[PDB]
Amino acid sequence: AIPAFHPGELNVYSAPGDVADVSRALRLTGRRVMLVPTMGALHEGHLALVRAAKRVPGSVVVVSIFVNPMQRTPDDDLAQLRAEGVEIAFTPTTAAMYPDGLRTTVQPGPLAAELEGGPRPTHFAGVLTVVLKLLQIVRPDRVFFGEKDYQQLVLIRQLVADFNLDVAVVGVPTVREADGLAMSSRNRYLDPAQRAAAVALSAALTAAAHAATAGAQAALDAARAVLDAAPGVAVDYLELRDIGLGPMPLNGSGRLLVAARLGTTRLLDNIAIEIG
Amino acid sequence: IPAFHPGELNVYSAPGDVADVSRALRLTGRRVMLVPTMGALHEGHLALVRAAKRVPGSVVVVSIFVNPMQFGAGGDLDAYPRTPDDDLAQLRAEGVEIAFTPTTAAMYPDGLRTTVQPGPLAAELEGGPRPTHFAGVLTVVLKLLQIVRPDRVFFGEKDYQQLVLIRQLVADFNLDVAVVGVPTVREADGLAMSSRNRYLDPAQRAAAVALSAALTAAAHAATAGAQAALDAARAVLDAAPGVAVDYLELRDIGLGPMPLNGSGRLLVAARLGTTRLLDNIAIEIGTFA
Ligand SMILES: O=C(O)[C@@H]1COc2ccccc2O1
Ligand SMILES: O=C(O)[C@@H]1COc2ccccc2O1
């Protein structure tokens, strides 16, 4: 007997089998199941993923909330989802998700060792493992991820292609504060000087995107100049790549990515670039 | 979907074609059974096909793919038996409606990129000297399950360690599929059927009976305990001319970090000339606990 689902309200499930049963039953009634994976502490960036998911006709929206140890405000997160008209939150325990410990896992391809995988060499294995599991639990038609974690998003699309997963991956543009700073729960840690200097990341990227009519080197030099004008911003990398994160082609579409440390806080940003 | 003629054998090579046809069958109430194989089919495989057939409303998909990722460099891959015509004739005879025969290029367009890493069980027994062997198997089995999306997936108990790791895969990645183990089919003398058996000359074929002899001896000696069971198996193997034992181990049924209780599985692997054979049996210790 299928678990109780109440249309038009927030239905919370902690058991994987429960969310699995409700989702399967909803899909057979002609709903299209959309998955939005989060680690809770929700902000506007998450709500933008929510809104994209909601505007697919016949959608029912699953927001998972789960702090993944291989890679929190409960009632607040839940009230945000309620206010967005999300119908399912999936809130499992670590024991429900990992009932036999870490045993079989996903091993990402070589891209997981670069860029973010430099300081965190096992981070992406953890993320791919947890995403693969959420996909199998919920079986969504579409899964939504923000572009702010661009390398993550690329790795997810490799997971999906490589394991023949039958789901559409949707990347949603970065939601920014008014001065351009990419939204992230880490932004709250920045003191005023840091918060003011942090704008250099988005400013450098957008400057590069416009300098790019003058080519790749102009674009990288424009970005570096802007980063160079900021105090207390330790750049770990600034790299132009193709959109799949291979080597930048002589012209065409690319992606410029940056990561930097302000005090103890690590920030990231990235932007589409068109060369020429 | 591409064409699907029922009551007949439909052969698809493109993952997209079998996935579409599979989905359509499932959207109209049939229950898709998957039997994954490396071809060179024999009666051990047909027992898997018959178990699948007997599931009501079933449509059976047999895949045939010699997966290069689970082989070690050094000739094993080029030496594997390929008999496609016989394979497909047997499936026709069994009333299988779907054969999935993908290309290496269709399965590995990006080479080895995203892959499955098994638990530590994959580093032991068969994986000890072949440490990437089970990553290859679990990767292709994951992909076949995502392409075909069966309700149930069938495997022989002969490759028992592989069956166990597959159940691990399925539990650990929350796959919505039931894994059915099917008992080993045996020659009249006891020899576990395997595509490898054709590689035994008549002498080796005569000697090979020692594996199953040792295991069933041990299963009956087991009333007297684990040591008696193991010593019986070992003595039988010691009396076999030309059998080189790789391992003989008694484990818990999960093969795992639990000590052996009253129910176990006894596993053997051995070389006759260059041919490596495996077999295993259920074992009940003492009372039969
Ligand atoms: O809370 C978030 O923004 C992150 C972003 O990406 C995620 C990927 C897998 C599982 C949860 C995830 O949530
Ligand atoms: O043909 C066989 O014996 C094997 C049986 O085990 C297999 C496991 C994964 C993929 C194919 C397989 O076929």
From Swiss-Prot, chain B:
Gene Ontology CC terms: cytosol
Phenotypic consequence of gene deletion: Simultaneous disruption of panD and panC gives a mutant unable to grow in the absence of panothenate. The double mutant has a highly attenuated disease response in BALB/c and SCID mice; immunocompromised BALB/c SCID mice survive on average 36 weeks as opposed to 5 weeks for mice infected with wild-type bacteria, while immunocompetent BALB/c mice survive indefinitely. In wild-type mice bacteria grow for 3 weeks then undergo a steady decline, bacteria persist over 8 months in SCID mice.
Applied use: Subcutaneous immunization with the double panD and panC bacterial disruption mutant protects mice for over a year against subsequent virulent M.tuberculosis (strain Erdman) infections; mice show mild lung inflammation and fibrosis despite a chronic bacterila infection. This is a promising attenuated vaccine strain.
Binding sites annotated in the UniProt record for beta-alanine: Q70
Main subcellular location: cytoplasm
Mutagenesis / variant outcome for changing Q162A: 50-fold reduction in activity and slight reduction in the affinity for beta-alanine. 30- and 40-fold decrease in adenylate formation and pantothenate formation, respectively
Effect of Q70A: More than 1000-fold reduction in activity and 45-fold decrease in adenylate formation
InterPro entries: Pantoate_ligase (IPR003721), Pantoate_ligase_C (IPR042176), Rossmann-like_a/b/a_fold (IPR014729)
Residues binding (R)-pantoate: Q70, Q162
Catalytic activity: (R)-pantoate + beta-alanine + ATP = (R)-pantothenate + AMP + diphosphate + H(+)
SUPFAM superfamilies listed in its UniProt record: Nucleotidylyl transferase
Family (UniProt): Belongs to the pantothenate synthetase family.
Additional remarks: The reaction proceeds by a bi uni uni bi ping pong mechanism. Was identified as a high-confidence drug target.
Protein name stated in the entry: Pantothenate synthetase
Organism, scientific name: Mycobacterium tuberculosis (strain ATCC 25618 / H37Rv)
